[PDB]
């Protein structure tokens, strides 16, 4: 029965190790991702949460009938 239907304990042992490594890395990635989102939303210095401002190319830099702009 063991020879025909099953494998040795090493396969399950090392598959468990691989699965555990993947799961732990995903957990730490999720925690880091939440922290990064919080910091970016608080400070606004990252690529995320970049809310639009007025484009400066719309300004007209020509004389304006009056010296004082």
């Amino acid at each position: 029965i063991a020879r025909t239907f099953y494998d040795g304990p090493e396969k399950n042992y090392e598959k468990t190790m691989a699965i555990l490594q993947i799961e732990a890395e995903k957990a730490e990635l999720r925690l880091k991702e939440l922290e990064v989102r919080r910091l970016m939303r608080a400070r606004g210095d990252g690529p995320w949460y970049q809310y639009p401002t007025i484009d400066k190319a719309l300004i007209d830099h020509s004389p304006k009938t009056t010296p004082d702009n």
Partner: protein, 175 residues
């Protein structure tokens, strides 16, 4: 027989008295024993001899699996999942082996109690003491762990016991 180790499962040298008949009456136990031998034990022995002859023509082996010693939970980092996994598996194996050690000692105790008859209270003192020591050590190691026991919980229990012993010794040095 030689199938099991006699050091792990000891027994006394088995003294039996010689028959000392005091009457001329025939002993029915001996006659029935001879009848039982001739009509039961000889055919059974012959059948077993045939089966062992068949087994001898087909001889193959199986082996006891040996496990290396991996680091235990003490020298695993807080969030290292692989070292924690291997340490936990090793701890589970050690727990199983400790259970079977207690089982061996209990078997010794039971066999002693049956073997000694009316003298078991005095003649099984060594087995009782061995079971007491093993049971105390096992209770210290594994009791109160709960439904979801782990090497970390056992480590915490041992650390709490060590702290209690250290404080007791420190306050004993002050008296």
């Amino acid at each position: 027989p030689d199938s099991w180790d006699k050091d792990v499962y000891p027994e006394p040298p088995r003294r039996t008295p010689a028959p000392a008949p005091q009457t001329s009456l025939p002993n029915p136990v001996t006659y029935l024993t001879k009848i039982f031998d001739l009509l039961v034990d000889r055919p059974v022995t012959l059948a077993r001899e045939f089966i062992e002859q068949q087994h001898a023509k087909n001889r193959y082996y199986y082996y006891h699996r040996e496990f290396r010693r991996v680091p235990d939970i003490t020298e695993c980092e807080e969030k290292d999942i692989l070292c924690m996994f291997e340490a936990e598996m090793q701890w589970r194996r050690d727990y199983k082996v400790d259970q079977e050690i207690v089982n061996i000692i209990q078997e010794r105790l039971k066999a002693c109690q049956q073997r000694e008859g009316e003298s078991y209270r005095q003649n099984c003192a060594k087995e009782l003491e061995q079971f007491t020591q093993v049971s105390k050590a096992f209770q210290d190691r594994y009791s109160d762990l709960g439904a979801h026991y782990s090497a970390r919980k056992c480590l915490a229990k041992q650390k709490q016991r060590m702290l209690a012993e250290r404080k007791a010794a420190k306050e004993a040095a002050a008296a």
